[PDB]
Nucleic acid binder design. Structure first.
Ligand SMILES: [Mg+2]
Ligand SMILES: [Mg+2]
Lengths: 286, 82, 82
DNA sequence: AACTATGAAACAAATTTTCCT
DNA sequence: TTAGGAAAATTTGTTTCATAG
């Protein structure tokens, strides 16, 4: 019995752990069927994402099955508006054969011991399905508009001696697939500082794209559930700045009366809607 | 090829479209009749009347989301201000 | 009483009858569609269908409350069905 | 004499697909 | 093939003007 793609899975079980070494670039412009291939998903510096398994000595080679799934909240499932796109030929180090499960496309690539079970996902581009065709499918009610962010999901089924097979799943960082979004949405590449006392009052030079001059970094605190309790304007522009750099003053945490450090999230919102993806920051005790 | 809400779904709504959260068989029938009345009379450019209505009425407040904007209903913004 | 259905009223209902009480313009179109896709295909024998569903399903309980016998939804039992 | 309900037209504008180098 | 731009299409969200109870 195969494992349904909708079923979430852990990244590790006991000693078995499948982890993404290098995550993909914050954005990849997917191609439509009516057009040519718009290359493979890439990695920040210049390479392509890398996936690795942990704790597999048996000499049998394994299969890592890549598939495009959702990002935006809830349970991670395959993405109804996107499909992976096999990329082979001339270049491309990693090899793969495709298949289609349920209604999703799934690429499988070789996970071999001769490379301590680590493969470079250099063969998977993204294909966009016409929101029209997919919204009116069979008993499906997922929103396609504005939904253009996906995740490179990776799976591997480890074969044990007892005949048992524990299933491991990953999930890459969200990727922005829309050309328009990639261009007009605020992007944060490399932070600068991560800690500061609840008091605040420190600089943290942010770098990324779409950092205009009307940008305005905002801070917020979420819950284990998903509720909001804090949104404090974090004044910017000490003067000017670098075309895509931003020097913001770290605000003053909720009540400053904390014995145990608190990790927090802060984004960038250019236009009245053009928001950026949440970030991470850490406050310290009293 | 849109599937229609099954009877139970509809019958349930008809019982809830009543503040009492309970209705009589005849009332349920009339809830259905009113619905027939509607979709029969407005089978024209409804989708337009839906954009219109969401904007005209103040009780429909569009709110922003991490994903996209979505419509909501201010249950208070309704009622009387006579 | 028995007021006729208005775009405002149906719209409110489509939205409120959503998991988190909020939906996209397109989702509201969908809702209306499934309603169209019923109230144009209803058999000339729907009342029987309604009576049939009321008792057949364990989610619709008849109670002797108030004025006369009325129908009601056993929410949790209905929620199970799904 | 407020208050309510329905609908075509014309904008303005945000997003998605198809086209073109 | 692999992109980068951007025109062509689609969609959404506002207002205004008229009609009737
Ligand atoms: Mg409104
Ligand atoms: Mg019953």
């Amino acid at each position: 019995s195969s494992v349904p793609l909708e079923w979430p899975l852990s990244s590790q079980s006991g000693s078995y752990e499948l982890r993404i070494e290098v995550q993909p670039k914050p954005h990849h412009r997917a191609h439509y069927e009516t057009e040519g291939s718009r290359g493979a998903v890439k990695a920040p510096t210049g390479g392509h994402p890398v996936v690795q398994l942990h704790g597999y000595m048996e000499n049998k080679p394994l299969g890592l099955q890549i598939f495009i799934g959702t990002a935006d909240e809830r349970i991670l499932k395959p993405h109804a508006f996107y499909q992976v796109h096999r990329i082979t030929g001339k270049t491309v180090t990693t090899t793969s054969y495709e298949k289609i499960v349920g209604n999703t496309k799934v690429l499988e690539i070789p996970l071999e011991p001769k490379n301590n079970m680590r493969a470079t996902i250099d063969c998977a581009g993204i294909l966009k399905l016409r929101n029209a065709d997919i919204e009116l499918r069979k008993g499906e009610t997922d929103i396609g508009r504005k939904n253009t962010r996906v995740r490179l999901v990776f799976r591997v089924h480890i074969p044990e001696s007892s005949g048992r097979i524990v299933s491991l799943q990953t999930a890459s960082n969200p990727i922005e697939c829309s050309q328009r979004s990639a261009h007009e949405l605020p992007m944060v590449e490399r932070q600068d500082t991560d800690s500061c006392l609840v008091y605040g009052g420190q600089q943290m030079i942010l770098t990324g794209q779409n950092f205009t001059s009307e940008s305005k970094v905002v801070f917020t605190e979420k819950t284990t559930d998903g509720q909001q309790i804090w949104e404090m304007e974090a004044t910017v522009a000490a003067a000017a700045a670098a075309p895509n750099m931003l020097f913001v003053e770290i605000p003053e945490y909720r009540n400053k009366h904390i014995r145990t450090p608190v990790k927090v999230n802060f984004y960038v919102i250019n236009g009245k809607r053009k928001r950026s993806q949440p970030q991470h920051f850490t406050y310290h005790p009293v | 090829m849109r599937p229609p809400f099954t009877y139970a779904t509809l019958i349930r709504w008809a019982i809830l479209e009543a503040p009492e959260k309970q209705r009589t068989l005849n009332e349920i029938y009339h809830w259905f009749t009113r619905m027939f009345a509607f979709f029969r009379n407005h089978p024209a450019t409804w989708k337009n009347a839906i954009r219109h209505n969401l904007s005209l009425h103040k009780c429909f407040v569009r709110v922003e989301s991490e994903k996209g904007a979505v419509w909501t209903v201010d249950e208070l913004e309704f009622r009387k201000k006579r």
